[PDB]
Design a protein around this ligand. Structure first.
Ligand SMILES: [Fe+3]
Ligand SMILES: [Fe+3]
Ligand SMILES: [Fe+3]
Ligand SMILES: [Fe+3]
Ligand SMILES: [K+]
Ligand SMILES: [K+]
Ligand SMILES: [K+]
Ligand SMILES: [K+]
Ligand SMILES: [O]
Ligand SMILES: [O]
Lengths: 522, 522
């Protein structure tokens, strides 16, 4: 009888952890502690020291992605925020100092003898919460986190999580990763709530009466005009095979009524001036049966997108890892703290049935800065007699691997492969996680590259697909949230993608660099 | 209408890989290669050089478990066997040499720079089949195996697998791990067949007509008297809650019609003179819904037992690891090559529903020679409102871990804990897997100990069970297959187990070192 309301398509709900745009490595506390200390505090202090440097940096597109505050006009509120959160920072530096002590002062004292004494000397922040052992040489001690006891600790604190609602008025997004997530304008609403909260599911599922929205707003502890603003984000609430390239590395599929979404990133709608025919949140089906993530890079598992869709998701598939290290924290446990309750980790070449499809994980090597990170896979999906490979940014640095893989998995019809063949220094993503820096020129040799032409070619030659699509190029303007979009057919990447398309056509098959949305047969 | 036959209860079917009694570390080829080279070849050559040393060693019980051939009388056949398998050995040393080359000559050349060149230089045995990366210091290169491509390689060879049938005429078993598995007597039958073969399931399931046994025997490539001997191993084929300690660390449970078996080791029957009231293969239910293995030690996952029961098993639970190293090869993949088709790996404090029970994995630290081995867990089973902890040989070397664990899991009613508080040097299990030995006195500090009294006490104090049972003591005589059974209440272990039982009673609860079979309430 009563009117029902749902979240507007043009309102974004941005994830925030400890004051910053939320992504994987900010959830576990030991990795948060490293980022806060080695990066975020340095960004605030630098900024507070001379806001004009940042202002001046932000003024040039080519500096976008550096350690700059973009809301540089808001010095007072940023300072007030930094000042207020100083106790969060001191609690968290306890953990930072504990890991330093373990790595620098405790582990190096031992040289092959029983490691029992170490446990007796642990800092309290880590007592009961780590395991130590020797590496392959039997003499150099190392450790790993007992991940769930870390999340149970005082240092993982849900009260430091928030979302920020705001309108979306264009396709393009400003780089967000280095700016505190404050209520910078009155169109914005910053709300304290855990990212896993069923309250956010209520929000995204919608279909609420007006008095139900008020109840919800009260459960968020909103009153007054803030509740009114909240209410204003809502509006009256308005079957066979598909293969839909939606953007970057994100692909949607349907097969005999089972739905799939790989490497999810979606754009918004309801505002004038954006590009036509984009696949947005409004275009999603009711249920996403299988959500597949290839690896733990920002551009392939976007928190903002994951939360907006959580309520529709059945099962999440992801790469398996037990490293339980600062460079390679447990991905399934991250997704579970985001509130995904049915997450399955898949090892190399394991197979899982999904609806009428079969999924197989494929070895993914490279693009991780030669770090010890196990959390990465390609996904092969067999949809009946048609098989599709999502390779994401996986490389072909290991000659023959794909030949050996083909011998086991058989033929593949279609391949999606990414060709960001020149990428970031591995330290611009991972550097705050190091114990210390590498010498600058050495570091510079460690980069996050996808396949170049030759590599991509050998992949194709080895698997013999009829269709090849290059993808994951960070061209869509909404990807700017997380990376520096700036195209031009000089860029070696574009050249190489072209060479590859060439190559595949010459050999008598279809190929194309996908750029915006594309329907495909399957 | 026709008579049906089943395998006798007093015929053992012993697993064999590459001529040796089969256990986990002989299945993956890279680990097999290390054992063949660093141990098994040395045992044969030593023996062939002076059979009397071994004869003389074997004559003394206290030397049992050392590197001795027990079938020392059979020099000719052993030599003939060694001679014939020499090509298996040369193929496998190719792999051994490849890993040496990778570890000693390739990885150490690099010091922080991109590792791409390494892939170009790999020995052919490892091309396409490893991933290299840096450790935590960013400068010391390391690697891991791409496990499934190793099993696809020529170096994993099912044709080198066999079983050996033989009568069991007493409770006690001779130590088997260091004697080639040859047809030493006419009561014995050695048959070439993969350990995963459905042929063995046919054997163990039984219910075959006499002409069906002949078909089976033909499928094993048996004829003549060997087929007749095979036939002779068969004989005419002859509902609510339980908790049954069956032996060593092995426990059986039923709960609302769901069946469970932890750390499976069973004894045989059908021969006179054995102990009364043992729980043997004949005592198993039709289906084992859930098979749980705490860790990858010989005494907790006995191939011989696992194969005899495979056909009855639903699902196997095991600890999760991605290390994919020689010290810590993938356990789920080992079980899958044994032919278990539904294996699930569980991380620390993850929960899984099993029938009407819930299972939770618990952190297991220690007893692994401070090696980097992730493949180990305790299992908590919640059977309705009653909860049982199987700790196996897990220790309490990390003070507070159990307190922190209790905070998450809540109360536990019953605990099984193992108190082999003085155990083997870690090198007597793992030493052939090392790249090189440790200095002798250092090595001697690395041992495989379970909890002693104080440790075991703090575990109990932290979890507050009403019932405590010490278990995993290697007392049952059939455990001699795999360890040196030799009891006496001097042994510090027995003292400490006693102290613990004491402690628990004093605090007003039940406790006992279980010794042979015991029914229990649940
Ligand atoms: Fe990536
Ligand atoms: Fe990417
Ligand atoms: Fe053990
Ligand atoms: Fe044991
Ligand atoms: K917490
Ligand atoms: K299929
Ligand atoms: K093979
Ligand atoms: K229960
Ligand atoms: O990525
Ligand atoms: O063990």
């Amino acid at each position: 009888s009563h009117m029902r309301y749902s979240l507007r398509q043009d309102i974004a709900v941005e994830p925030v952890i400890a004051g910053w745009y939320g992504w994987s490595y900010l959830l576990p506390p030991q990795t948060l502690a490293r980022f806060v200390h080695n990066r975020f505090n340095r960004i605030v202090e630098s900024y507070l020291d001379d806001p004009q440097v940042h202002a001046a940096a932000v003024r040039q597109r080519r500096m976008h992605g550096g350690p700059w505050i973009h809301a540089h006009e808001h010095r007072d509120a940023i300072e007030a925020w930094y000042r207020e959160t100083a106790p969060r920072r001191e609690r968290l530096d306890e953990l930072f100092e504990a890991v330093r002590r373990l790595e620098e002062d405790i582990l190096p004292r031992h040289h092959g003898e029983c490691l029992d004494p170490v446990y007796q000397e642990l800092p309290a922040a880590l007592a009961g919460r780590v395991e130590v052992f020797y590496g392959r040489d039997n003499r150099t001690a190392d450790y790993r986190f007992v991940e769930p006891l870390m999340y149970a600790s005082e240092y993982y604190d849900e009260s430091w999580q928030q979302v920020r609602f705001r309108p979306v008025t264009e396709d393009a997004r400003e780089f967000a990763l280095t700016t505190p997530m404050l209520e910078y304008g009155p169109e914005q609403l910053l709300v304290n709530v855990p990212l896993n909260s069923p309250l956010l599911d209520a929000v995204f599922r919608g279909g609420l009466t007006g008095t139900e929205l008020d109840d919800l707003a009260a459960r968020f502890g909103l009153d007054g005009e803030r509740a009114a603003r909240f209410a204003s984000y809502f509006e009256p609430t308005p079957e066979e095979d598909v293969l839909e390239y939606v953007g970057h590395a994100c692909v949607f599929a349907r097969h005999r009524g089972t739905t799939f979404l790989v490497d999810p990133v979606l754009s918004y709608s309801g505002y004038p001036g954006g590009a036509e025919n984009r696949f947005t949140f409004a275009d999603l089906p009711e249920r996403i049966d299988h959500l597949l993530i290839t690896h733990n890079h920002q551009d392939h598992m976007l928190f903002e997108t994951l939360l907006r869709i959580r309520h529709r998701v059945g099962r999440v598939l992801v790469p398996k890892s037990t490293n339980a290290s600062l460079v390679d924290p447990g991905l399934g446990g991250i997704l579970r703290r985001l509130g995904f309750t049915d997450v399955v980790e898949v090892d190399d070449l394991e197979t899982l049935s999904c609806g009428s499809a079969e999924v197989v994980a494929l070895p993914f090597l490279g693009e991780h800065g030669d770090l010890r990170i196990r959390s990465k896979t390609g996904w092969l999906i067999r949809f009946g007699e048609r098989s599709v490979l999502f390779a994401a940014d996986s490389t072909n640095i290991s000659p023959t691997m794909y030949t050996k893989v083909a011998e086991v998995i058989g033929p593949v019809d279609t391949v999606f492969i990414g060709m960001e063949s020149i990428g970031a220094a591995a330290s611009w993503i991972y550097g705050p996680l190091y114990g210390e820096p590498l010498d600058r020129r050495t570091d510079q040799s460690r980069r996050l590259n996808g396949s170049n032409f030759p590599q991509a070619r050998e992949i194709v030659d080895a698997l013999e697909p009829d269709e090849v699509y290059v993808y994951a190029m960070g061209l869509e303007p909404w990807m700017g949230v997380v990376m520096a979009v700036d195209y031009d057919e000089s860029h070696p990447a574009i050249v190489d993608s072209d060479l590859l398309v060439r190559h595949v056509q010459d050999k008598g098959g279809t190929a194309e660099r996908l750029h915006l949305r594309r329907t495909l047969r399957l």
